[PDB]
Design a protein around this nucleic acid. Structure first.
Ligand SMILES: Nc1nc2c(ncn2[C@@H]2O[C@H](COP(=O)(O)OP(=O)(O)OP(=O)(O)O)[C@@H](O)[C@H]2O)c(=O)[nH]1
Ligand SMILES: Nc1nc2c(ncn2[C@@H]2O[C@H](COP(=O)(O)OP(=O)(O)OP(=O)(O)O)[C@@H](O)[C@H]2O)c(=O)[nH]1
Ligand SMILES: Nc1nc2c(ncn2[C@@H]2O[C@H](COP(=O)(O)OP(=O)(O)OP(=O)(O)O)[C@@H](O)[C@H]2O)c(=O)[nH]1
Ligand SMILES: Nc1nc2c(ncn2[C@@H]2O[C@H](COP(=O)(O)OP(=O)(O)OP(=O)(O)O)[C@@H](O)[C@H]2O)c(=O)[nH]1
Ligand SMILES: [Mg+2]
Ligand SMILES: [Mg+2]
Ligand SMILES: [Zn+2]
Ligand SMILES: [Zn+2]
Lengths: 339, 347
DNA sequence: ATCTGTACATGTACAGAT
DNA sequence: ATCTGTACATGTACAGAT
DNA sequence: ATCTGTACATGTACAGAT
DNA sequence: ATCTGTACATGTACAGAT
């Protein structure tokens, strides 16, 4: 039943090949153009495709163009925890996010203009968004969200001190090492000079290193169903989102965040046995429903930032989604059979 | 259970002793390391790498023996395996002073290393420290220190190579079911080391850096022995086995062919065979130590203990240790086992 | 003025001491 | 159970070199 | 600084065995 | 139906060459 839904959601090797061939061509060319400002940006592949939790089709790719910036001093934007002003080549741009993003965007647009071999344009800017989004066609439509990121090597900002609570799951050495990696700021505004913390590199490591046992999902270990539960939850939200515009405030990052909390609460690999796929997916739904009822879903890395605060999503939107989730749950998920 | 807990208490190093030992050792090592740079010496660029029992937290009784590698990156090198041994190699291509004819001479390089070290120790006035008489074929320059208490420091010259590990290790390090494939792949991306062992130009592979990572990352669960996880008894078993051999070795010269590396190697195989943290529960310390002894005994009787990293190299071959020596040790181990380990009460 | 090899500054796991 | 010394990895300041 | 070569993890596809 | 073995595909870290 759920195994059959997963088969439908499984990407095809043929489609992966053709999509990657084109995406890589464009990304490689844009990256080269950035190397003569922005000289020295490096590529960092992130999100669902590179975490192996993309579903249905290879039609959405996420790439960070990270740029190492020396001595930078952060000031937290009021008490938000996730948003910062940045202070001290890039003198052209207090470091303005929208100004930097504009130049980044312009360069990208100029280079896409010179691309004749592939059918590719740049999507109209969504205000406040950090992304420069490319729309490709080898007939099939493919999105590429290209994210400018500042890389900083200092200690992570104080607001994350008590975040990433993996100690009982992945452990203290993993946590200490992860927090020795750089941190990232992307120009998602809150206004025009604000940046937002990104942990896409950390999320990627976790997705690919997700077990309490080192062998989880390896050739000489036991398969778990952690990723399959993530896929099913993503698909449920995607399907619901297609039908009801009441759910515009919700995104896949809410699901990702929720499952991180679940994986922390249930650290044992044996609590995610493939044979218990139903129970596992069900307990995930129950957890997400408690998050909705209590209007509380803390950022996994920034515990004081509630993604489900009133200020961000209306009670009515949360109650709408609850009713819709409870319905699918108690009727054998008819929405999975939809197209 | 509790008898063995009491032995471990005795074996536990004291923080006072650790402090005083480390203070002195670090002073000497730092000074020797600086001498290798600050002068236009062939060893310019050596880096320090702390290895062995003290740095793995399995040193027992006293902080009286420290192991330190002075590693030197050597680019374009071609290795030739010395007669299918698997562990021994000739090296070919600053260091031209030792490059006796395409071949990089181990003993020549070790001699110069040794001379420099001797000269620098001679200039040390703060501390009571001399250089021990060279043991032929040994790779070590050994320092003997006294803040009254006697402390050995074995300083090992090592060539660092960043290429893939030699073919003879391909099927070694069988940690797939225990620490897993990602850990193994990453470990094998680290450099490999050659220490100075026809004979005078041969070098031997070293995996001290890999052994160190394993000792400190020894569980199938990432939380093994961490503040938010469960204690295992893997290291405690290693200490007990080390102590049994150490005690036996100080009494009987019949056991001169044996060393702590045999015990370390044996326990690596045991940890591979019994990968689950639950097979090394603290409450089962006795059973765990017992099964280790039984395994070591089988190795001795069948004359077979494969190097953990170089499977075709048998540390217990006839060619290396007489059957007599192995039978002597078997009898001695079986005796202690079946009489409540009287040798643990000694001293 | 700028760059750099060396030493120090900071954080934390591990294990011993209390 | 909490506190504390050592080791070790990574960042960063800087007298000496360029 | 950039580019490639190598090795192997994480996938998908499918047949034969269980 | 599930598991196991092989083949085929992509991603990615890092060394050595340029
Ligand atoms: N902090 C933060 N990170 C976000 C947010 N949205 C997206 N991200 C990050 O950007 C990545 C890409 O976002 P998306 O492409 O929308 O989602 P995805 O995880 O790739 O999954 P898909 O919906 O299958 O594409 C996510 O995996 C996160 O790492 C957000 O609101 N906050
Ligand atoms: N890799 C990565 N991609 C990100 C991150 N933040 C945002 N993105 C990308 O940018 C897209 C839009 O970012 P959002 O966080 O949704 O921002 P927005 O669309 O301006 O605002 P809302 O969706 O209303 O919150 C995401 O779908 C991702 O593809 C991040 O931290 N990392
Ligand atoms: N391949 C190999 N490595 C060895 C051998 N002897 C020692 N080593 C390595 O060098 C390290 C130091 O050796 P020792 O000081 O004799 O032993 P140890 O492991 O530190 O334990 P102690 O007996 O407490 O000193 C070991 O941990 C090994 O990594 C040997 O015969 N062969
Ligand atoms: N760190 C480190 N120390 C090593 C290594 N190999 C040897 N040593 C040290 O050097 C000492 C002598 O090396 P061995 O190979 O044991 O000496 P040998 O002269 O060949 O003979 P025995 O000591 O009788 O086995 C060891 O006890 C260690 O202290 C190595 O790979 N790494
Ligand atoms: Mg995505
Ligand atoms: Mg030692
Ligand atoms: Zn898994
Ligand atoms: Zn343990």
């Amino acid at each position: 039943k759920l195994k059959k839904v997963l088969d439908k959601l499984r990407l095809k090797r043929k489609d992966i090949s053709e999509a990657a061939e084109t995406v890589n061509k464009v990304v490689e060319r844009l990256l080269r153009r950035m190397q003569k400002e922005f000289k020295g940006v490096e590529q960092l592949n992130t999100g669902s495709y590179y975490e192996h939790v993309k579903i249905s089709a290879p039609n959405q790719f996420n790439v960070m163009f990270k740029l190492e910036v020396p001595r930078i001093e952060l000031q937290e934007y009021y008490e938000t925890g996730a948003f910062y002003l940045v202070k001290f080549p890039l003198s052209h741009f207090v470091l303005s996010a929208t100004k930097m993003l504009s130049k980044f965007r312009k360069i990208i647009k100029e280079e896409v203009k010179e691309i004749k071999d592939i059918d590719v344009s740049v999507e109209k800017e969504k205000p406040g968004s950090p992304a420069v989004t490319l729309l490709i066609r080898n007939p099939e439509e493919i999105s590429v969200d290209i994210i400018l990121a500042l890389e900083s090597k200092g200690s992570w900002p104080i607001s994350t001190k008590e975040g990433l609570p993996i100690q009982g799951w992945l452990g203290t050495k993993v946590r200490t090492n992860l927090r020795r990696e750089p941190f990232y700021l992307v120009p998602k505004n809150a206004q025009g000079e604000t940046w937002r913390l990104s942990f896409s590199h950390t999320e990627k490591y976790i997705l690919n290193n997700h077990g309490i046992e080192k062998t989880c999902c390896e050739s000489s270990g036991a398969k778990c169903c952690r990723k399959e539960c993530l896929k099913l939850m993503k698909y449920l939200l995607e399907q619901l989102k297609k039908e009801f515009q009441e759910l515009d405030a919700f995104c896949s990052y809410h699901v990702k965040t929720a499952i991180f909390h679940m994986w922390t609460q249930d650290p044992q690999d044996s609590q995610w046995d493939p044979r218990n796929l139903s129970s596992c997916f069900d307990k995930l739904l129950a957890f997400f429903l408690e998050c909705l009822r209590t209007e509380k879903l803390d950022h996994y890395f920034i515990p004081k930032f509630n993604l489900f605060s009133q200020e961000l999503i209306d009670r009515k939107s949360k109650e709408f989604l609850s009713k819709k989730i409870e319905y699918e749950r108690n009727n054998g998920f008819p929405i999975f059979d939809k197209l």
